[PDB]
Amino acid sequence: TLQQYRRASQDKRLDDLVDLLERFKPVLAREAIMQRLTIKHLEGQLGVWRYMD
Amino acid sequence: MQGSWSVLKKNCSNFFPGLLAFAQQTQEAYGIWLRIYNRQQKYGPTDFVEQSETFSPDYHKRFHSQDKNMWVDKELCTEVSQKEVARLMTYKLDMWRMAHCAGALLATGGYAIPFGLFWLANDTWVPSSFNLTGEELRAWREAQDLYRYRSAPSYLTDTKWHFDFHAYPWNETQERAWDDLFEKNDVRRDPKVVRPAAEMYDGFIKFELIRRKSLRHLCRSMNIPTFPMLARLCNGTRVRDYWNLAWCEDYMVITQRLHESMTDEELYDYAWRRYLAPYDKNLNREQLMERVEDYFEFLGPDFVAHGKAPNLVILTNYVLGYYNDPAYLEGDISELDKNDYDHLASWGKDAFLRRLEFENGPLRDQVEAHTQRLLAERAAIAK
Amino acid sequence: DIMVPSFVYNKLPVIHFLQEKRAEQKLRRVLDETYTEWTEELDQAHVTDAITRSLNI
Amino acid sequence: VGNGPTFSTGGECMNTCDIQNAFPMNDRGVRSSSPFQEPNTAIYDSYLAWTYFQPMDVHIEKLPAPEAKYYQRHTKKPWDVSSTELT
Amino acid sequence: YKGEVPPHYTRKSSATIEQVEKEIDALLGGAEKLRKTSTDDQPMDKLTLMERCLRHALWSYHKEEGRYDFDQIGRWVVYTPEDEVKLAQLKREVEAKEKLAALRKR
Numbered sequence: 213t214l215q216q217y218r219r220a221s222q223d224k225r226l227d228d229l230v231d232l233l234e235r236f237k238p239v240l241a242r243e244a245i246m247q248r249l250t251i252k253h254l255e256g257q258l259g260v261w262r263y264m265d
Numbered sequence: 266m267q268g269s270w271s272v273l274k275k276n277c278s279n280f281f282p283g284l285l286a287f288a289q290q291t292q293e294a295y296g297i298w299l300r301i302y303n304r305q306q307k308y309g310p311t312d313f314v315e316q317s318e319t320f321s322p323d324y325h326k327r328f329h330s331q332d333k334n335m336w337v338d339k340e341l342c343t344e345v346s347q348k349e350v351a352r353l354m355t356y357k358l359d360m361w362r363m364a365h366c367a368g369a370l371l372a373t374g375g376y377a378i379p380f381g382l383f384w385l386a387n388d389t390w391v392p393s394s395f396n397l398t399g400e401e402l403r404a405w406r407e408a409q410d411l412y413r414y415r416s417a418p419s420y421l422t423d424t425k426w427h428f429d430f431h432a433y434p435w436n437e438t439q440e441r442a443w444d445d446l447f448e449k450n451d452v453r454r455d456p457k458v459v460r461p462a463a464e465m466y467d468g469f470i471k472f473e474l475i476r477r478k479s480l481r482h483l484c485r486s487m488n489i490p491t492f493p494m495l496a497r498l499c500n501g502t503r504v505r506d507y508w509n510l511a512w513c514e515d516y517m518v519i520t521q522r523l524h525e526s527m528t529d530e531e532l533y534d535y536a537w538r539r540y541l542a543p544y545d546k547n548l549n550r551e552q553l554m555e556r557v558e559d560y561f562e563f564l565g566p567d568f569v570a571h572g573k574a575p576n577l578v579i580l581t582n583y584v585l586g587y588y589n590d591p592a593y594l595e596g597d598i599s600e601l602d603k604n605d606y607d608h609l610a611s612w613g614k615d616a617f618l619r620r621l622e623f624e625n626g627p628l629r630d631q632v633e634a635h636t637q638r639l640l641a642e643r644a645a646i647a648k
Numbered sequence: 649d650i651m652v653p654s655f656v657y658n659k660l661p662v663i664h665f666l667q668e669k670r671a672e673q674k675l676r677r678v679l680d681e682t683y684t685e686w687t688e689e690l691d692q693a694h695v696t697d698a699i700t701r702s703l704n705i
Numbered sequence: 706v707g708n709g710p711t712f713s714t715g716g717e718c719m720n721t722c723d724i725q726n727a728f729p730m731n732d733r734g735v736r737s738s739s740p741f742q743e744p745n746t747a748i749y750d751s752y753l754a755w756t757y758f759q760p761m762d763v764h765i766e767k768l769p770a771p772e773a774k775y776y777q778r779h780t781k782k783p784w785d786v787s788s789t790e791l792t
Numbered sequence: 793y794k795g796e797v798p799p800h801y802t803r804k805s806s807a808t809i810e811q812v813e814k815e816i817d818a819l820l821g822g823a824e825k826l827r828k829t830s831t832d833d834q835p836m837d838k839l840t841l842m843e844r845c846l847r848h849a850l851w852s853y854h855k856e857e858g859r860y861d862f863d864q865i866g867r868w869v870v871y872t873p874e875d876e877v878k879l880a881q882l883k884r885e886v887e888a889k890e891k892l893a894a895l896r897k898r
């Protein structure tokens with residue numbers, strides 16, 4: 213009976229968690245991209261066109 | 266969209282049927298507009314009918330006022346239906362473009378024929394009547410959506426940059442509204458959070474003070490021809506009329522909840538005329554309903570209560586934000602492992618570059634210490 | 649070829665900084681809206697008391 | 706290390722420019738010549754002061770490559786020309 | 793005391809709690825080298841914030857479901873002294889029930 217009562221909260225919370233994970237993944241992708249850009253910048257092999265792209 | 270031979274053939278084949286359909290639509294829309302204009306002149310407020318003058322505080326240039334020169338006919342449903350209003354709006358767009366083309370023809374005589382060939386090779390400025398099949402209509406809508414994508418970001422950037430460079434929000438809620446207003450379409454904007462931007466911009470700029478360049482960008486984004494632009498009070502009048510019709514239809518739908526009963530294609534068209542739902546997104550009914558409800562919420566309760574919509578500039582920005590797609594990014598991340606200045610490797614380093622590498626390289630601390638000690642010794646010897 | 653490119657290049661740093669700050673603000677707002685909802689459940693003592701009453705004790 | 710150039714500066718000192726906050730500051734107190742983080746940024750004093758960054762071999766913990774879904778945006782348009790193609 | 797069963801909700805996406813936890817662990821495992829610890833009063837990093845949010849949601853869901861693992865709940869859900877009080881209250885209750893069942897069986 214308790215499980216049935218605490219169910220809609222559970223489903224909505226699970227969907228929200230999945231959405232949050234999908235929202236966070238792009239941030240990590242951007243962070244990795246910036247890391248690589250910084251790496252190439254420190255080597256003096258980065259063009260502004262690449263950075264803008 | 267760029268011109269093509271296939272579209273040229275399509276439009277050439279359907280030229281005369283398109284003209285005939287345009288004439289029939291012209292008769293029907295003239296009837297509808299006659300009804301609407303009679304109703305406005307009879308039941309319209311004194312200021313709206315008399316065309317009250319609103320002048321700018323700097324150069325005293327007259328322009329339409331949202332509060333006075335725009336009026337919502339809450340009782341228009343008795344005389345005119347929603348479908349008639351949408352038909353009138355579509356015909357207004359088509360008639361504007363046809364009028365510009367006809368004016369060019371009259372001005373240049375028979376020398377506009379090659380320009381007409383250019384015109385028929387693209388669906389951007391042809392009327393909707395020239396499409397006699399579903400696929401042709403889809404291509405035409407795709408061209409219109411492409412033009413909207415091309416034009417809207419410039420308008421949004423103009424507005425945002427001018428405001429941010431010349432002013433700042435007063436309070437935190439205004440800041441949040443302003444920042445969230447100009448988000449890309451990939452994220453969903455909460456109209457309640459965004460609404461205060463309307464009042465803030467009313468404090469900054471109203472529809473009566475809209476600049477001519479911003480107006481040109483907006484008219485581009487609304488598929489309204491801009492050449493010859495002329496004074497800002499002509500296309501401004503066009504914009505005012507179009508949005509007044511849209512607001513009348515929106516009030517009708519909200520009061521009668523027509524959108525719930527509206528079919529899928531009609532709902533998609535209704536959203537499209539509001540610049541909310543691009544056809545290339547292949548939206549479903551759920552997304553269309555969500556966007557329409559967000560639009561109604563942004564209009565706010567006061568729209569139903571008194572027929573007063575929020576600032577038209579901010580409304581246009583909000584609706585056109587759906588065409589502000591995320592900036593494109595193509596190419597695998599592995600491409601970042603390459604190098605861009607390999608062609609310079611043969612040149613090597615000159616004396617100055619070697620000195621800079623030595624001074625600012627990993628040995629920089631040692632060099633700095635040695636240099637400072639030597640300078641101190643020389644200074645002491647001098648004294 | 650010369651002017652607009654140079655001014656775009658001049659613009660890049662400030663825009664990058666502001667967009668980074670905006671992303672940080674989004675993350676901060678996401679975090680700040682998280683609250684744990686401690687739930688309260690009917691104490692079993694009352695259940696035991698009702699059980700005793702049903703027994704006619 | 707290579708002889709390649711870096712992010713352009715325009716002969717300006719970022720510790721005194723009108724947008725100095727946009728340039729990160731390192732431990733030594735020298736603002737970077739670019740939005741990126743620079744550990745060995747320096748300042749030179751000719752008639753006017755100017756900032757410089759010397760490229761060097763430095764290792765940075767590289768986050769694993771993400772999926773193409775989470776960073777690729779296929780919103781390209783016929784009028785769009787990339788900066789590389791433009792160059 | 794509660795009332796009516798809440799209105800039914802349809803999931804927008806299909807996914808299991810175990811799958812979500814595995815995905816979270818995979819996401820946080822690649823950034824372990826980049827992730828850097830710091831003082832509690834010092835500002836947090838993006839990785840730390842993501843980890844805290846994800847773990848908070850996960851453990852709230854677990855506690856609601858019934859998986860009462862106090863060791864992790866006290867870590868990823870405690871941010872208020874009220875929450876410490878709640879943990880202490882819940883900790884006593886579980887031990888009391890376990891003892892009561894054992895003696896009632898004995």
Ligand SMILES: CCCCCCCCCCCCCCCCCC(=O)OC[C@H](COP(=O)([O-])OCC(O)COP(=O)([O-])OC[C@@H](COC(=O)CCCCCCCCCCCCCCCCC)OC(=O)CCCCCCCCCCCCCCCCC)OC(=O)CCCCCCCCCCCCCCCCC
Nearest residue numbers: 318319320321325326327328493494495496497498499502
């Ligand atoms: C190949 C073709 C060649 C063509 C050449 C001819 C010129 C070009 C033709 C037209 C081109 C198309 C575009 C034109 C501009 C459009 C502007 C626009 O968007 O208007 C929108 C606007 C509509 O908006 P709206 O909201 O309805 O109303 C405007 C608001 O009121 C706005 O509200 P507001 O707040 O802005 O209110 C202010 C508004 C108020 O004004 C208006 O808007 C009202 C309309 C204009 C009224 C103008 C008349 C004013 C009274 C004149 C009195 C003269 C008395 C003289 C007596 C002499 C006795 C001896 O503006 C003014 O106050 C301006 C007043 C005018 C000042 C004139 C100063 C001139 C100085 C001269 C210096 C010296 C010259 C040299 C020396 C000469 C002497 C030796 O349109 C108008 O109002 C009227 C538009 C008229 C367009 C021009 C028509 C051209 C007809 C040409 C016929 C002849 C052809 C000859 C061909 C020859 C062979 C090739």
Ligand SMILES: CCCCCCCCCCCCCCCCCC(=O)OC[C@H](COP(=O)([O-])OCC(O)COP(=O)([O-])OC[C@@H](COC(=O)CCCCCCCCCCCCCCCCC)OC(=O)CCCCCCCCCCCCCCCCC)OC(=O)CCCCCCCCCCCCCCCCC
Nearest residue numbers: 291294295298360361363364365367368371372493502503
């Ligand atoms: C043969 C001589 C030629 C002379 C040289 C001409 C050179 C070319 C210049 C352009 C001429 C006009 C071209 C045709 C335009 C089509 C008709 C029209 O106005 O369409 C409505 C439409 C009105 O626009 P709107 O913004 O909606 O109007 C706002 C009003 O509040 C609207 O008020 P509302 O909100 O109450 O709504 C009313 C609406 C309600 O109605 C509806 O909604 C139903 C639809 C009605 C309009 C249907 C238009 C259909 C257009 C397409 C036609 C088919 C084309 C087929 C092409 C292919 C053929 C094979 O009905 C109207 O649209 C009525 C507008 C007022 C009438 C304007 C016509 C006046 C001239 C004609 C009379 C001339 C009498 C001469 C007497 C001589 C005595 C000696 O026209 C336009 O799109 C505007 C024209 C755009 C091009 C502008 C180019 C620059 C013009 C500068 C002129 C300066 C003065 C002349 C000298 C030039 C020197 C450089």
Ligand SMILES: CCCCCCCCCCCCCCCCCC(=O)OC[C@H](COP(=O)([O-])OCC(O)COP(=O)([O-])OC[C@@H](COC(=O)CCCCCCCCCCCCCCCCC)OC(=O)CCCCCCCCCCCCCCCCC)OC(=O)CCCCCCCCCCCCCCCCC
Nearest residue numbers: 266267268366367369370377378380381382383384387390
């Ligand atoms: C049968 C048909 C049905 C009946 C007729 C119906 C009516 C039809 C007419 C109305 C149609 C209206 C709609 C038209 C739409 C299309 C317009 C258009 O052109 O689109 C661009 C159109 C392509 O459009 P699209 O690809 O679809 O892209 C459209 C996008 O949406 C792009 O859109 P967007 O917005 O980005 O593009 C806009 C763009 C449109 O412009 C362009 O795109 C530029 C087009 C030309 C580019 C040329 C590049 C190549 C140059 C080659 C040079 C020579 C090379 C060597 C040749 C050697 C030969 C041996 O910019 C503008 O709009 C600028 C407007 C400028 C207005 C100028 C006003 C001046 C006023 C003067 C001042 C007056 C002040 C007042 C004074 C008052 C005094 C009292 O361009 C072309 O197709 C290029 C054609 C190039 C032809 C070859 C080069 C020229 C050949 C000349 C031959 C001369 C022979 C005689 C020589 C005699 C010597 C003595």
Ligand SMILES: CCCCCCCCCCCCCCCCCC(=O)OC[C@H](COP(=O)([O-])OCC(O)COP(=O)([O-])OC[C@@H](COC(=O)CCCCCCCCCCCCCCCCC)OC(=O)CCCCCCCCCCCCCCCCC)OC(=O)CCCCCCCCCCCCCCCCC
Nearest residue numbers: 365366368369372373376390481485490491492493494495
């Ligand atoms: C590296 C070197 C390369 C080569 C370089 C070449 C050398 C160039 C050097 C100089 C360049 C700069 C010159 C600047 C001059 C000053 C401009 C100025 O003051 O403008 C103020 C102002 C600026 O215009 P705006 O309206 O504010 O916005 C302009 C934006 O571009 C609007 O942009 P938007 O984005 O807002 O709108 C885009 C779109 C928006 O879409 C639409 O608007 C829909 C479509 C509209 C179609 C057109 C409707 C026209 C309605 C009637 C207009 C009034 C007519 C007046 C009576 C006729 C007068 C002739 O509109 C269009 O797509 C427009 C398409 C126009 C295509 C034609 C462009 C010219 C190409 C060359 C053809 C002619 C060659 C002649 C010489 C060779 C002969 C063998 O001009 C006007 O108010 C426009 C008045 C137009 C009057 C008609 C033209 C008068 C000039 C003489 C025409 C002679 C025709 C000869 C035929 C053939 C005879 C054999």
Ligand SMILES: CCCCCCCCCCCCCCCCCC(=O)OC[C@H](COP(=O)([O-])OCC(O)COP(=O)([O-])OC[C@@H](COC(=O)CCCCCCCCCCCCCCCCC)OC(=O)CCCCCCCCCCCCCCCCC)OC(=O)CCCCCCCCCCCCCCCCC
Nearest residue numbers: 324326327328475476477478479493494495496497498499
């Ligand atoms: C290849 C080359 C070939 C050769 C080329 C030869 C070139 C000659 C060079 C000299 C030309 C000088 C004039 C340049 C005009 C363009 C200026 C411009 O674009 O300024 C942008 C300017 C900048 O705006 P913005 O910065 O974006 O915004 C500022 C404000 O917010 C804007 O807010 P707003 O729009 O509310 O405020 C403005 C509006 C506010 O006012 C209103 O809205 C009320 C409108 C009142 C209109 C009053 C009209 C009165 C007419 C009386 C006629 C009576 C009948 C007479 C009959 C018998 C005699 C014929 O007032 C006006 O702008 C209208 C002023 C009066 C216009 C008069 C008609 C045009 C005369 C052109 C000739 C001038 C003399 C040339 C010779 C000397 C040169 C030093 O915007 C405007 O001015 C917009 C309106 C533009 C209208 C004029 C252009 C119309 C198209 C021309 C059609 C004819 C083409 C002929 C081609 C010939 C080829 C050979």
Ligand SMILES: CCCCCCCCCCCCO[C@@H]1O[C@H](CO)[C@@H](O[C@H]2O[C@H](CO)[C@@H](O)[C@H](O)[C@H]2O)[C@H](O)[C@H]1O
Nearest residue numbers: 295298299300301302303304305306307308309314315
């Ligand atoms: C070359 C020119 C081209 C012009 C193209 C456009 C033409 C448009 C014509 C529209 C005609 C409308 O017809 C007109 O409508 C108005 C408004 O209802 C009526 O107006 C009537 O009612 C209004 C409102 O109570 C009263 O203020 C007015 O005193 C009275 O006459 C006119 O009696 C009628 O003649």
